[PDB]
């Protein structure tokens, strides 16, 4: 639509959703064959190509609920996208979340008002598609890549003075990022399938960072789990 | 505590959580060996007994978030209960939810204020324990019992003039019941494991009912999946 | 309906509403003549019998807004119940509320979302029926039983980390329990009459407890005021 | 304080609270002896005088929660006022509320945010002082003046496009006015006594009006009940 | 209407809106020629007269959102008032707001629920009419009267235990008063023009007061800017 | 910081804030001299260059409150940016907003929860810096470029089933976009200066579109007003 300059057919049934349009470029060129780039609108690149003879697209989302909602909306409405898989990172908020872990979000908490706007006095708990969830999980187990299944927290403010993540951590939440709630909610709304796969960028509470070498490895594992889940 | 008249040790690591204290009585006597009844307070019976040489307790919860929260709180705080497994029914709100299906709740939406009281402007999405979730799922697949994984809706009002379930159905929600949010939220809060396994009592939207014979079968499958998941 | 296995006529115009179905059993057998038990569904016993030649029923409610709402709904809708009188206990939250006092709730505050779901941005203050309120008050004065008239607080969480009762106490609130808001709101909604009569179970803030002998006496006074108000 | 130009002692233990400062002037001159006028600030007149040898003050409040809160605050804080009695009118919202009826508010619903600001996710139900309530009720019964006891609705918007009074009426609410919630809430907060006594200005829903002769009579009865309750 | 006893034509296109009906009396008699007083209802005086041969009315509002809303509603609906200009004072909440400054409100924050009632989950930011805003600003600059343009905070509680003004100050808010949000919101709603011009009554946070001589001067400047803006 | 790969000094006191990083590239190359590009992180380009010998930077923001908040935060915190000026487009929601008009936002309404998270029960009305506002306005008047001053609406959902813009239009709101509330709120919070200047992309309600030639012209006028306001 408005935000994606592609012709129908240029986008696959399955799309991967990095936040960074350069991580989109990177993924495609490193992982896929016969790459075509279908969108340059706003520099939020989308690429279609193939992986083991099966078409896969990879589309930047931007940061925040309102940005990804745009792309997820159009991908669904204008291009009949069936599987949508966020591949990104999160800030870990618990010691037991290890920097090599690969996270599969079952659900997500949020301070985005997107759902309270739709639902009023209902707390809508979004939900990953289980078939995709299990595939990814199996793909990880099969190869021995360390994986954790629980929830994340989709923030509106990266810099947030009134952050309640200390309380979210006690309730089991694994980490913070900025897209999952939007993804899971829009996909379910339109009878599509979605899943969010995440790496640990750093520990937000211990302030402790992860090295460029740790980031590259888990990144590659993430893409692997995503691609192998779709085989 | 206050609500459970038991001596420490009388309650197993794993407790099953029917809504009905008579379904508690029924489950124990039909499924377990050497049954002892540890609680008669308020007629909300709890029973400990064994299944294949492993201790399992079964404790009535009552109906509603505030009732189950009581029992889940005390079971956790006063008796160090590790696994808590709701076995109950739900009203289905989608055609694709079939009356023979067995539901495993990944998460739950609610109009209970329990979480908005704790979290303010955060929408807290509760989360099933995945290890328990997968066990139950495997137990079902192994035996060929039909199973669905998604979300339910924990209502406060059984009779609810302002029910939004028509909108919840469009977003993928499977059915309505009255306990899951409380269960999943309290268990995560205290580092314990929880899962909610449900049968389809009827279709709320199509008004269409399920027969006493359908109810008995799926009920038995539910208990099986619950017990076999714990083996 | 669904929750009460009775035939029409088996339930009186006036029903008393203990929380505990065993306190239901107890009340009936101790206070009424020719007791019939009309409901065993879920072990939430209801009993009809007579007191001085006038029919009175006594029905367990369970704990929490969502539980009592069920019974109050069905009692009203399926059995044309006119007077509904909660007889239960509360935790006192002020020094001036004395352990021998009998409380008549004029109204109730809540953190239940039941009313915000119905009303949006209106704070609905529920209201006892005054004719019943005055009767009970008179019955107490006549016999010299100590009585207090003010408000209570209907909680959702018995165990509540974010309890504001310290602020509720300053505003005059007398004590905490878990049913009144539901009772008063549903009864008014259907043009019926309701009242909540309560004993002081203990002081929540001073942590100070009440003895089994104090509980028995005030309990008996409570039933007396309830029964004599209905004479 | 800021809003009342009086010297300590100039204001009685008991104050009556009309909305209209000219109804303040009127009440005093018609009902009281040896009238002194203690406040002319902003033309919101307050008068002290006597009725049967007992001092009574009468103080205008203005319209709206935020206006009366000012006067009730200062009367309490700066002049140790013990009894505060709103004498005003309301718009009736039910057929059964008759234009000659005199209303005693047990409680009040509101769309004012005053309490949600103080309490967050608690619905605070304000509460009339029962001793004052009963006195007024008795005074009415004694003289045979028709009286009704229930709740009113304190509005913020006189002209309100999103008025929910049609729903409030079904739940038993008697009528709409603009002060009671503030009165009852501030008085309880400071351990004082308050009551709101109201006449039916008109029926808001039937659009049907009341004549100048009906208004005068019920007005006089209102003052009588107020004064006789204080005797 | 109900609240203003005037005949059509008695009220000018432009009305000034002091809070105090005696400041209404004062303004008219000091600033206008051939003064007629059109309203005495409730002692909330309105006056029409002339200033340099142009008709200007001046109408008391009372205190609080719900009070001014009444007068602004009727002035708009029953008397086709085009320009409405609040002339009042505010409590300053920042050091940089100087006691001689004259404030022009671009917008206003509030804890009034008036807008959340209308809009649900939208934060409605009210807006001054810019043409009026600029006129007033120019009038000030022309004469060298010190002027500041930013936002104020419309409070519901003058005495407010849960005041967040310390946080409002950090976000740039200039001062607190009790009417602006109502004014700006109702005027925009009906395609009319509104502006709020304010003097600094005192600094709320530094507790520091302003002398009767400072108040008189800035008051006079305020009226000047208001009148000259309308020339 | 994290999101901007620049060295201190590389970013000017004044930054322009298009949504589109390619509109950032375009603006700089067309309007500025000696352009250096300081940021390529995530392809959200920032450029510093000069306009009439004065340094001006131009930085992409992405779409949505959470995206721009990131850039506005870092620009303020890590690079001491003083003036921040959004240059973008909006969807007009009123007939009187003409496709050639240039909008200066005094304030903005939102359904973003960003402020309710910070403020609870306060409606925070953000506020443009008036000195910048007036400069831009003057720059427009001087050259005769058509300009309108009022409010806009910052949406979270571009595709929004529960859009209330029909009600926002009646209250005077000019158009919808996705950044202003974040901009104005963060800038005020840190004692900086902000303004949002917008073109009319299309009329959302009349569905009627604007041609590529209309867009180019108003775009150029927008940049002119922005640059000339800063001269």
Residue numbers in the entry:
A (entry chain A), B (entry chain A), C (entry chain A), D (entry chain A), E (entry chain A), F (entry chain A): 2 to 232
Please give the exact wording used by the authors of the publication that reports this structure.
Purine nucleoside phosphorylases (PNPs; EC 2.4.2.1) are versatile enzymes that catalyze the reversible phosphorolysis of purine (2′deoxy)ribonucleosides producing bases and (2′deoxy)ribose 1-phosphate. For this purpose, we choose the hexameric PNP (BsPNP233) from the model specie Bacillus subtilis, which displays great biotechnological potential to produce NAs, including the antiviral drug ribavirin. The crystal structure of BsPNP233 confirmed that it is a homohexamer with D3 symmetry as observed for other hexameric PNPs.
The crystal contacts are similar in the crystal structures solved in P321, P212121 and P6322 but differ in the H32 space group.
